[PDB]
Amino acid sequence: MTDRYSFSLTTFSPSGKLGQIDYALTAVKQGVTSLGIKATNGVVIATEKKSSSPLAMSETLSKVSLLTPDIGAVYSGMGPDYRVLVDKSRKVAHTSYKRIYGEYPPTKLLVSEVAKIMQEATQSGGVRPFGVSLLIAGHDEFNGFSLYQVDPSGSYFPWKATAIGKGSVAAKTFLEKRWNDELELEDAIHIALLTLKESVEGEFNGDTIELAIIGDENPDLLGYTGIPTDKGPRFRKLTSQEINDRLEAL
Amino acid sequence: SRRYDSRTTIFSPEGRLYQVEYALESISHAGTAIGIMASDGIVLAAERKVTSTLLEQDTSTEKLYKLNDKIAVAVAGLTADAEILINTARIHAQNYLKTYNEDIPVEILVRRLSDIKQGYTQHGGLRPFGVSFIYAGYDDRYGYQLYTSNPSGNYTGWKAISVGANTSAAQTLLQMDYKDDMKVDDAIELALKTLSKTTDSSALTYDRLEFATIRKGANDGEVYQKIFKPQEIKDILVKTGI
Amino acid sequence: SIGTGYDLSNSVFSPDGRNFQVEYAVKAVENGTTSIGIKCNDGVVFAVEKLITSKLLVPQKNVKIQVVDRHIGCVYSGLIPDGRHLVNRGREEAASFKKLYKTPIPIPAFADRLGQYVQAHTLYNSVRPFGVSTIFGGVDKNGAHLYMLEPSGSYWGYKGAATGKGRQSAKAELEKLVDHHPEGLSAREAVKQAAKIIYLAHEDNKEKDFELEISWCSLSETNGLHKFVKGDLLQEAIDFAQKEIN
Amino acid sequence: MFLTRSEYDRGVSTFSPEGRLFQVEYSLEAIKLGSTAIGIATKEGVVLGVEKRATSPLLESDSIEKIVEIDRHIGCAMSGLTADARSMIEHARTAAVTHNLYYDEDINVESLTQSVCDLALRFGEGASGEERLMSRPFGVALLIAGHDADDGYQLFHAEPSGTFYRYNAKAIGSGSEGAQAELLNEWHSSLTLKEAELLVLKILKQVMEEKLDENNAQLSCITKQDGFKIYDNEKTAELIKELKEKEAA
Amino acid sequence: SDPSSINGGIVVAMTGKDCVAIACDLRLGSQSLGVSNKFEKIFHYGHVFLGITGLATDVTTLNEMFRYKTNLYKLKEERAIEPETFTQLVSSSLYERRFGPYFVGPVVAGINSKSGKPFIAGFDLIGCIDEAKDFIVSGTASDQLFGMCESLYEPNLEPEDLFETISQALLNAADRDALSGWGAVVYIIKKDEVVKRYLKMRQD
Amino acid sequence: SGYDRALSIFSPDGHIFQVEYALEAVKRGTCAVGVKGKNCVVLGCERRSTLKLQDTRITPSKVSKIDSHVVLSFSGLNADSRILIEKARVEAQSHRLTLEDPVTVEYLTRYVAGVQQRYTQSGGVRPFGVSTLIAGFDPRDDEPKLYQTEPSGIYSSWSAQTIGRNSKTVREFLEKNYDRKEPPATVEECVKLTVRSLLEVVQTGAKNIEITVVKPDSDIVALSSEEINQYVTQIEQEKQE
Amino acid sequence: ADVKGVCTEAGMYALRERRIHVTQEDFELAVGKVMNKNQETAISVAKLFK
Amino acid sequence: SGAAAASAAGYDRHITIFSPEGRLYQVEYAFKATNQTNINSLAVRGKDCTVVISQKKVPDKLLDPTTVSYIFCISRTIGMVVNGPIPDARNAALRAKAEAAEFRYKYGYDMPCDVLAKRMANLSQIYTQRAYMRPLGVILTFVSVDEELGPSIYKTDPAGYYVGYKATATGPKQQEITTNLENHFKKSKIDHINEESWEKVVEFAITHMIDALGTEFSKNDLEVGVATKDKFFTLSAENIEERLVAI
């Protein structure tokens, strides 16, 4: 049986609840597993690539994507509602904050400028929301490292170590069986792939996986050696071979 | 009957708009929020529902907020629709100061900011906000103040309220022990008792909560938006002997 | 009526990837007169059954061909006004192809400014598609052309075209010719060879009298423009036709 | 087919298979409510006349204005939905005044009646390709009693549907059907002014629930010389007792 | 007449060993007149300070709009403003009005509370960020002060040793300027405290 | 049925419904009253005080003032009340600007009404569940005046009115005790006619009343609770019987 | 009535150990099941709205 | 049970409505349109030369087969082939051909097929947010010979998904084809294909969509494209007569 308070959004039901949001959050739980957990000196962001056919180059499209040098992301759920989001997220650093403050933003003020790009599409009929989720993760220099979630409702729960998708609670069950307070990044990184060996089927190599880090500056990625203070990025995607040895260390 | 529930401009024959009242049960899902009016400084309070272990519930205040150095808020309702009308309020208070060069009174923005929540229960295919507030202020005309705003647009001034879940008792427990003097430190020891005795759990930790305080108490008079940190509610919390 | 839900509107898709309101418009063309166009070695000739409901109608001035700027013609079979709404967009944009480029509009580039327009109606919701299927061709730098327009938005290049209720018939007599004459008819036998057909295609409506109309465009006999007929040319073509079928 | 009126009723722009659209025909039924009205024309004077529906004994009944001035030589009545009147007449006068600018003359009466009827037609396209301003075609059925030089003394019936008529002796509202037959058979072309004011204060008696006095009624009479005036109470009570002094003999 | 050459005000900024110094003048009035002994041309937002010159409307009107903002950036990010953003904000908050602009010579001064550093800068009326380290000025009498401040400021100065070289740089100039100089004011700044002194000079 | 949803569409009778359904919402709200004599006009409203925590210095007072020489009351729901006033007083104050003669009261009520007859025209907008009472003199005139608005967009002049809850008791009470051709002629008498008009329905409370009067010279005043208890209790003597 | 499971549940430990009797301890863990495992039963969402 | 509560309780005529399964169904019903022609294309890489093939049916004789074609030269270095009805292929073709252009007017070079599949697919998403337009019932392929990446194939569907395959086919008959080159690649482990000449690589791709397709093909039933540096174009009919003589 139906409910007649679910085909639309602006309608309250007697339990004071709205219709379509509750189902979008199910559109992600049916989706693949993705995560990101935290450490003392860096943050990790991971997921896999359930390549549909064997002939699809699984490299021409990145689950992970850069927003600012210090900030990166990953989704779990629907795809096209990701690359349409970020293309109007990173801008908003370059539009609402940067040009009137000179510098790229913190990590949470970025989120506020995502989550209303997420909430513009849940206030008027004629708009399906974004059936996705996000794990924004980055760094700045008065509150420090960080991790953040962003649901389609526009709410952004923060977190420390978390995953999402179908293989969530199996993973979240596992993190605190392995998570601590004083953990370090290269210790927090092999955790976040042996977390993913359970929520998987078949092959578990660099060409069926991709993840990221956050750390100290990576000026070799910068390009314009000669300035003393412009320490370059803080975000780097680990290549295949840089992963494909760690597994044999495991 | 022919079901009059589908737009907030339909007017059932008995005269009552259904789709407003629904909002006023979309609030019970929220997390409690309390404020008592002292004789020498208001107190506020709060409580959270979700308190799993691996999420930073230390710095992130999600309910308590400010509007300026005089005014504070405690929310109870949907969270997508709190940023929308608490930045607007900040943007209203400044744009009063900016063009009368004196501070905002409470009875203005509560009067304003509630008419906004009435501009949506009337026109368009819009929805009404699922929101409530507990204002806490100061101003020359009346001094200490307490106020409240439903998701309709109707507001009323009070002396002590709880919103959100289980207010029924939390008013009842409150109204039969609220003395009328209630020095500030004697107010906090009341607010915890209400949340201690009304909630669903039995732990009432330091992480689940936040409660702040307004204070005129300094010499060379001025206002102090004192928000409390996790480390000192523990002093509040051991001191009572929970 | 496979789907009682997926027909009340447009801009939807059935479970079988279809939209049926187009598949019902096409049944409004079928309830319309016949119209054809033959391709020739130099140009084209058009034609139509022009029915008459009474004796009271004036002859030869309730015409049905609409002539676009001097070098392409358009004939209908269906609901006329949605048609005449359509040329009256094709008669204006072609100017806006001229005043930027100064050449008369070619034929294909005239199609895509129609075949792309019609497709717009069949993707919104606040509109209705067209109940026509109009033929149009003409002459340009690179020869002749001839096309069919169809309310799905499709158009394809035809040596011969026929619509209306005389579809299944005239799709035969235009198959015969293109076997006899691969070498290209001339523009003074196709015409009378058209009249043969509309007098053969009438016989779904042997009840009622009617009137015959022709319009023709080819370089030799006209110097590359569009034009009606008159005089011995059509009168003999009449005399040619009802002869052979008696 | 029996579901011809049940479903094609509510949207304005739905032809029913009988050709007709209903939501206008219901607007006509509105003015059948309200309080009645009459208009009689003459070679000497036009006259109106109404009841008032005494609702409570403490109201100040100069307020509900079923009759108005609209210009010095025109006057209206209305037996319909009230609030949709004051959106009408604040247009109808505005033409007459505007007309006194662009053409400097007392406007005719029918043109005014044609400007109204080209206003209620705005649930659609008006004359000059206009688009829309409402969706609620409203019941204010008027009687436009006026004078102009070309044709003398006139009245009209202006309806929401747009189409109007130059009635000579009309009566609209709730007490119509009992009246408009009664005025069918007592309208000469050679009456006076005061051979009509008594008349319209006889039909109004029998048709209305209560008895007749000054309080529950009034009337008006324009004239090319004086203008629109709404008569006075004690003046009307003169005519009422005059009538009785005619009845018994 | 130019807008910049009407009312009259002179401001100065100067770096020092873990200290800075900023000052301004108090005269104000129409062309060839003076009305008020008392118009604090200098302001402060958070720990970060600011000083303005030129037309008085666009003094009083820039105070408010910047005060409209930093009381949001504190509420929104839970952290005060520091200068090296503020100095960018005043550029783009003026370069939006490249046409129909304001008529100001601004300054800025403050410490960066992370690295304990000092900082100052200057600007023009459409946002050219000058980042001199020794000093920077603005006002009607700039040409009468880039000379009698250059020769007087060494590097690596001490607060009161740095104080008295502002005032004399500020007094011997304003006493020569034509449209300024009814009483002054100065601020000396350290990492964690501030004090206000006035100064003595002529009158009318 | 089907015809009892919207505003655009009519019954097969003529009735337009939603407007009729608002006025049912009036009657789920507290009373009000308005009386006039010759040198005075008055107004009353039964409030509540049914809660103790609520501070009482800012008591919910139906009354509002549009200008010096005008007052107002309402009924219905109050989320909308704040609106009409906030557009009403604007309009009075954007009149003397534009004209330097304040409002003929009949000009005002045709703007409180006017804002209701625009919010009953088009779907996508709701009416006002409200019904007012005006009271104020003109400038440079003595004639005391009183109207009421109503979400249908109409209005009429009234010598005495009572709206809100249980008004169908108070009217007939005022149909005897009044007489149009001999009004009260003193500022005490209208109040006594007005107080005992509340006492039928108000559980013989006296903290549950507010009265506010109006006079020429731009005069208005609210009365004192202790000034009512002697206007209350002295009546009770007069029904010692 | 949850208690009726407790006083039952306590003895169930002794059954597992084959002891017949109990003490306070065999109750002090019962609370760990009916109460905590009601809060650790269905509080396992994180998505919610304030 | 699958679509039973779908076909009954709405969820199949509005785009912007989710089902409690999470599935929205309208776009998942668009794909049935792609196969409304019974047509089946193909594409493969090269050393520097790319190719795409399509049937070109034999309807009633009256057509003028010069114009029936589902191969649209978009710009230079670019091309595309559709899978779906013609009209809903043009509006995608033309929204592109006026999009490669302005780029070259606004950025100073010609777009690749990367962006051209990310842009046009960044739109078909949008039209599955709003009700502007029914999503175009197609699934379209792109080709190019880029300067920085070499050959490149890409693909786009009505949701917005896009990936650059190494080789692929489409239509009603993917499984038969796709296996008849998936197995081919695991032989040699070359993402590309040998036979330097754009000529010799055609005859590879023809014969694989003969043995695994289900019949034999003439010159007229086909139409074929090709991409080479500086150009994109179509072809003649002799390439098969110089096949079966060798065999």
PDB file of N, CA, C and O in Angstrom, chain B residues 183-226:
ATOM      1  N   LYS B 183      18.604  32.921  41.445  1.00  0.00           N
ATOM      2  CA  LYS B 183      19.968  33.266  41.080  1.00  0.00           C
ATOM      3  C   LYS B 183      20.509  32.275  40.053  1.00  0.00           C
ATOM      4  O   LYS B 183      20.143  31.098  40.047  1.00  0.00           O
ATOM      5  N   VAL B 184      21.384  32.777  39.175  1.00  0.00           N
ATOM      6  CA  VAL B 184      21.733  32.078  37.933  1.00  0.00           C
ATOM      7  C   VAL B 184      22.227  30.661  38.196  1.00  0.00           C
ATOM      8  O   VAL B 184      21.760  29.702  37.572  1.00  0.00           O
ATOM      9  N   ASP B 185      23.159  30.500  39.127  1.00  0.00           N
ATOM     10  CA  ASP B 185      23.672  29.175  39.433  1.00  0.00           C
ATOM     11  C   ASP B 185      22.607  28.272  40.026  1.00  0.00           C
ATOM     12  O   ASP B 185      22.744  27.047  39.955  1.00  0.00           O
ATOM     13  N   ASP B 186      21.548  28.840  40.589  1.00  0.00           N
ATOM     14  CA  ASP B 186      20.409  28.054  41.023  1.00  0.00           C
ATOM     15  C   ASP B 186      19.446  27.755  39.892  1.00  0.00           C
ATOM     16  O   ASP B 186      18.508  26.982  40.093  1.00  0.00           O
ATOM     17  N   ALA B 187      19.659  28.337  38.712  1.00  0.00           N
ATOM     18  CA  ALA B 187      18.845  28.006  37.552  1.00  0.00           C
ATOM     19  C   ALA B 187      19.385  26.790  36.821  1.00  0.00           C
ATOM     20  O   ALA B 187      18.624  25.913  36.409  1.00  0.00           O
ATOM     21  N   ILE B 188      20.697  26.750  36.618  1.00  0.00           N
ATOM     22  CA  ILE B 188      21.323  25.627  35.938  1.00  0.00           C
ATOM     23  C   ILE B 188      20.983  24.332  36.643  1.00  0.00           C
ATOM     24  O   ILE B 188      20.561  23.353  36.019  1.00  0.00           O
ATOM     25  N   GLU B 189      21.108  24.329  37.966  1.00  0.00           N
ATOM     26  CA  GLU B 189      20.802  23.148  38.752  1.00  0.00           C
ATOM     27  C   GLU B 189      19.331  22.770  38.681  1.00  0.00           C
ATOM     28  O   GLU B 189      18.949  21.712  39.185  1.00  0.00           O
ATOM     29  N   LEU B 190      18.490  23.619  38.086  1.00  0.00           N
ATOM     30  CA  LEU B 190      17.125  23.242  37.749  1.00  0.00           C
ATOM     31  C   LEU B 190      17.045  22.669  36.349  1.00  0.00           C
ATOM     32  O   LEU B 190      16.362  21.665  36.134  1.00  0.00           O
ATOM     33  N   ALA B 191      17.743  23.280  35.395  1.00  0.00           N
ATOM     34  CA  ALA B 191      17.586  22.867  34.008  1.00  0.00           C
ATOM     35  C   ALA B 191      18.085  21.451  33.795  1.00  0.00           C
ATOM     36  O   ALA B 191      17.474  20.675  33.051  1.00  0.00           O
ATOM     37  N   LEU B 192      19.194  21.094  34.430  1.00  0.00           N
ATOM     38  CA  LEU B 192      19.684  19.734  34.304  1.00  0.00           C
ATOM     39  C   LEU B 192      18.696  18.747  34.891  1.00  0.00           C
ATOM     40  O   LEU B 192      18.490  17.657  34.345  1.00  0.00           O
ATOM     41  N   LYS B 193      18.066  19.121  36.000  1.00  0.00           N
ATOM     42  CA  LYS B 193      17.125  18.229  36.656  1.00  0.00           C
ATOM     43  C   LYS B 193      15.961  17.910  35.741  1.00  0.00           C
ATOM     44  O   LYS B 193      15.470  16.778  35.715  1.00  0.00           O
ATOM     45  N   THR B 194      15.522  18.891  34.966  1.00  0.00           N
ATOM     46  CA  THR B 194      14.437  18.650  34.033  1.00  0.00           C
ATOM     47  C   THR B 194      14.870  17.671  32.960  1.00  0.00           C
ATOM     48  O   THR B 194      14.190  16.673  32.699  1.00  0.00           O
ATOM     49  N   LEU B 195      16.027  17.916  32.357  1.00  0.00           N
ATOM     50  CA  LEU B 195      16.516  17.020  31.327  1.00  0.00           C
ATOM     51  C   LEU B 195      16.927  15.691  31.917  1.00  0.00           C
ATOM     52  O   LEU B 195      16.774  14.648  31.272  1.00  0.00           O
ATOM     53  N   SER B 196      17.429  15.707  33.145  1.00  0.00           N
ATOM     54  CA  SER B 196      17.784  14.467  33.803  1.00  0.00           C
ATOM     55  C   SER B 196      16.565  13.590  34.012  1.00  0.00           C
ATOM     56  O   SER B 196      16.654  12.363  33.909  1.00  0.00           O
ATOM     57  N   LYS B 197      15.413  14.204  34.246  1.00  0.00           N
ATOM     58  CA  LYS B 197      14.219  13.503  34.679  1.00  0.00           C
ATOM     59  C   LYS B 197      13.198  13.306  33.577  1.00  0.00           C
ATOM     60  O   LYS B 197      12.195  12.623  33.805  1.00  0.00           O
ATOM     61  N   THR B 198      13.416  13.903  32.412  1.00  0.00           N
ATOM     62  CA  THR B 198      12.464  13.854  31.318  1.00  0.00           C
ATOM     63  C   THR B 198      12.917  12.993  30.157  1.00  0.00           C
ATOM     64  O   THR B 198      12.084  12.591  29.343  1.00  0.00           O
ATOM     65  N   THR B 199      14.208  12.728  30.049  1.00  0.00           N
ATOM     66  CA  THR B 199      14.757  12.146  28.843  1.00  0.00           C
ATOM     67  C   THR B 199      14.373  10.681  28.765  1.00  0.00           C
ATOM     68  O   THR B 199      13.564  10.166  29.540  1.00  0.00           O
ATOM     69  N   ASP B 200      14.974  10.002  27.802  1.00  0.00           N
ATOM     70  CA  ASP B 200      14.736   8.596  27.548  1.00  0.00           C
ATOM     71  C   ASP B 200      15.863   7.726  28.063  1.00  0.00           C
ATOM     72  O   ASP B 200      15.616   6.604  28.512  1.00  0.00           O
ATOM     73  N   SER B 201      17.084   8.242  28.028  1.00  0.00           N
ATOM     74  CA  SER B 201      18.255   7.493  28.439  1.00  0.00           C
ATOM     75  C   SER B 201      18.351   7.525  29.957  1.00  0.00           C
ATOM     76  O   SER B 201      17.399   7.878  30.657  1.00  0.00           O
ATOM     77  N   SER B 202      19.501   7.112  30.481  1.00  0.00           N
ATOM     78  CA  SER B 202      19.817   7.286  31.887  1.00  0.00           C
ATOM     79  C   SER B 202      21.210   7.846  32.119  1.00  0.00           C
ATOM     80  O   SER B 202      21.595   8.036  33.275  1.00  0.00           O
ATOM     81  N   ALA B 203      21.965   8.135  31.059  1.00  0.00           N
ATOM     82  CA  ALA B 203      23.369   8.490  31.201  1.00  0.00           C
ATOM     83  C   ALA B 203      23.562   9.987  31.402  1.00  0.00           C
ATOM     84  O   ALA B 203      24.285  10.401  32.312  1.00  0.00           O
ATOM     85  N   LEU B 204      22.896  10.799  30.583  1.00  0.00           N
ATOM     86  CA  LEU B 204      23.010  12.261  30.584  1.00  0.00           C
ATOM     87  C   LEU B 204      24.462  12.718  30.712  1.00  0.00           C
ATOM     88  O   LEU B 204      24.885  13.307  31.705  1.00  0.00           O
ATOM     89  N   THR B 205      25.221  12.416  29.671  1.00  0.00           N
ATOM     90  CA  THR B 205      26.658  12.603  29.672  1.00  0.00           C
ATOM     91  C   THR B 205      27.001  14.077  29.534  1.00  0.00           C
ATOM     92  O   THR B 205      26.159  14.970  29.632  1.00  0.00           O
ATOM     93  N   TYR B 206      28.280  14.326  29.323  1.00  0.00           N
ATOM     94  CA  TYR B 206      28.800  15.622  28.943  1.00  0.00           C
ATOM     95  C   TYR B 206      28.778  15.858  27.440  1.00  0.00           C
ATOM     96  O   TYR B 206      28.833  17.012  27.008  1.00  0.00           O
ATOM     97  N   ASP B 207      28.710  14.799  26.636  1.00  0.00           N
ATOM     98  CA  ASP B 207      28.826  14.942  25.193  1.00  0.00           C
ATOM     99  C   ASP B 207      27.487  15.261  24.558  1.00  0.00           C
ATOM    100  O   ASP B 207      27.416  16.038  23.602  1.00  0.00           O
ATOM    101  N   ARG B 208      26.431  14.668  25.088  1.00  0.00           N
ATOM    102  CA  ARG B 208      25.089  14.831  24.565  1.00  0.00           C
ATOM    103  C   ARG B 208      24.559  16.246  24.695  1.00  0.00           C
ATOM    104  O   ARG B 208      23.607  16.595  23.994  1.00  0.00           O
ATOM    105  N   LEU B 209      25.135  17.056  25.566  1.00  0.00           N
ATOM    106  CA  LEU B 209      24.552  18.317  25.976  1.00  0.00           C
ATOM    107  C   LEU B 209      25.366  19.515  25.529  1.00  0.00           C
ATOM    108  O   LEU B 209      26.530  19.409  25.140  1.00  0.00           O
ATOM    109  N   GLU B 210      24.708  20.663  25.597  1.00  0.00           N
ATOM    110  CA  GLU B 210      25.369  21.946  25.720  1.00  0.00           C
ATOM    111  C   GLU B 210      24.397  22.912  26.357  1.00  0.00           C
ATOM    112  O   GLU B 210      23.213  22.911  26.020  1.00  0.00           O
ATOM    113  N   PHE B 211      24.892  23.710  27.295  1.00  0.00           N
ATOM    114  CA  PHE B 211      24.080  24.766  27.867  1.00  0.00           C
ATOM    115  C   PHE B 211      24.916  26.001  28.117  1.00  0.00           C
ATOM    116  O   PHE B 211      25.985  25.927  28.724  1.00  0.00           O
ATOM    117  N   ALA B 212      24.417  27.123  27.632  1.00  0.00           N
ATOM    118  CA  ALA B 212      25.080  28.402  27.676  1.00  0.00           C
ATOM    119  C   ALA B 212      24.352  29.340  28.618  1.00  0.00           C
ATOM    120  O   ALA B 212      23.316  29.012  29.192  1.00  0.00           O
ATOM    121  N   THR B 213      24.902  30.541  28.740  1.00  0.00           N
ATOM    122  CA  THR B 213      24.456  31.512  29.718  1.00  0.00           C
ATOM    123  C   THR B 213      24.719  32.902  29.199  1.00  0.00           C
ATOM    124  O   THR B 213      25.792  33.183  28.662  1.00  0.00           O
ATOM    125  N   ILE B 214      23.777  33.730  29.376  1.00  0.00           N
ATOM    126  CA  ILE B 214      23.964  35.161  29.244  1.00  0.00           C
ATOM    127  C   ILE B 214      24.286  35.713  30.620  1.00  0.00           C
ATOM    128  O   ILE B 214      23.829  35.187  31.638  1.00  0.00           O
ATOM    129  N   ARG B 215      25.090  36.770  30.661  1.00  0.00           N
ATOM    130  CA  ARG B 215      25.541  37.348  31.914  1.00  0.00           C
ATOM    131  C   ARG B 215      25.728  38.839  31.740  1.00  0.00           C
ATOM    132  O   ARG B 215      26.485  39.277  30.869  1.00  0.00           O
ATOM    133  N   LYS B 216      25.037  39.602  32.571  1.00  0.00           N
ATOM    134  CA  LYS B 216      25.348  41.000  32.798  1.00  0.00           C
ATOM    135  C   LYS B 216      26.349  41.176  33.935  1.00  0.00           C
ATOM    136  O   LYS B 216      26.839  42.287  34.150  1.00  0.00           O
ATOM    137  N   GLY B 217      26.725  40.089  34.611  1.00  0.00           N
ATOM    138  CA  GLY B 217      27.339  40.126  35.927  1.00  0.00           C
ATOM    139  C   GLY B 217      28.634  40.895  36.117  1.00  0.00           C
ATOM    140  O   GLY B 217      29.136  40.961  37.244  1.00  0.00           O
ATOM    141  N   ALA B 218      29.192  41.478  35.060  1.00  0.00           N
ATOM    142  CA  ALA B 218      30.458  42.180  35.183  1.00  0.00           C
ATOM    143  C   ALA B 218      30.250  43.612  35.669  1.00  0.00           C
ATOM    144  O   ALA B 218      29.181  44.207  35.506  1.00  0.00           O
ATOM    145  N   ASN B 219      31.298  44.160  36.281  1.00  0.00           N
ATOM    146  CA  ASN B 219      31.352  45.584  36.567  1.00  0.00           C
ATOM    147  C   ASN B 219      31.752  46.340  35.306  1.00  0.00           C
ATOM    148  O   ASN B 219      32.308  45.770  34.362  1.00  0.00           O
ATOM    149  N   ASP B 220      31.471  47.644  35.298  1.00  0.00           N
ATOM    150  CA  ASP B 220      31.529  48.436  34.074  1.00  0.00           C
ATOM    151  C   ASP B 220      30.624  47.805  33.010  1.00  0.00           C
ATOM    152  O   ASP B 220      31.070  47.308  31.973  1.00  0.00           O
ATOM    153  N   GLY B 221      29.329  47.841  33.326  1.00  0.00           N
ATOM    154  CA  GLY B 221      28.291  47.048  32.694  1.00  0.00           C
ATOM    155  C   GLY B 221      28.357  46.800  31.202  1.00  0.00           C
ATOM    156  O   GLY B 221      28.568  47.720  30.407  1.00  0.00           O
ATOM    157  N   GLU B 222      28.157  45.541  30.825  1.00  0.00           N
ATOM    158  CA  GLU B 222      28.118  45.086  29.441  1.00  0.00           C
ATOM    159  C   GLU B 222      27.665  43.634  29.481  1.00  0.00           C
ATOM    160  O   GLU B 222      27.488  43.051  30.555  1.00  0.00           O
ATOM    161  N   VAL B 223      27.492  43.055  28.299  1.00  0.00           N
ATOM    162  CA  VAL B 223      26.875  41.745  28.146  1.00  0.00           C
ATOM    163  C   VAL B 223      27.937  40.727  27.769  1.00  0.00           C
ATOM    164  O   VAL B 223      28.982  41.066  27.206  1.00  0.00           O
ATOM    165  N   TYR B 224      27.667  39.467  28.097  1.00  0.00           N
ATOM    166  CA  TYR B 224      28.645  38.391  27.968  1.00  0.00           C
ATOM    167  C   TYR B 224      27.941  37.115  27.522  1.00  0.00           C
ATOM    168  O   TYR B 224      27.271  36.463  28.325  1.00  0.00           O
ATOM    169  N   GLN B 225      28.114  36.745  26.253  1.00  0.00           N
ATOM    170  CA  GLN B 225      27.489  35.551  25.680  1.00  0.00           C
ATOM    171  C   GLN B 225      28.211  34.276  26.115  1.00  0.00           C
ATOM    172  O   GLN B 225      28.738  33.517  25.305  1.00  0.00           O
ATOM    173  N   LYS B 226      28.220  34.025  27.408  1.00  0.00           N
ATOM    174  CA  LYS B 226      29.020  32.921  27.917  1.00  0.00           C
ATOM    175  C   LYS B 226      28.440  31.588  27.482  1.00  0.00           C
ATOM    176  O   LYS B 226      27.361  31.188  27.926  1.00  0.00           O
TER     177      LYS B 226
END
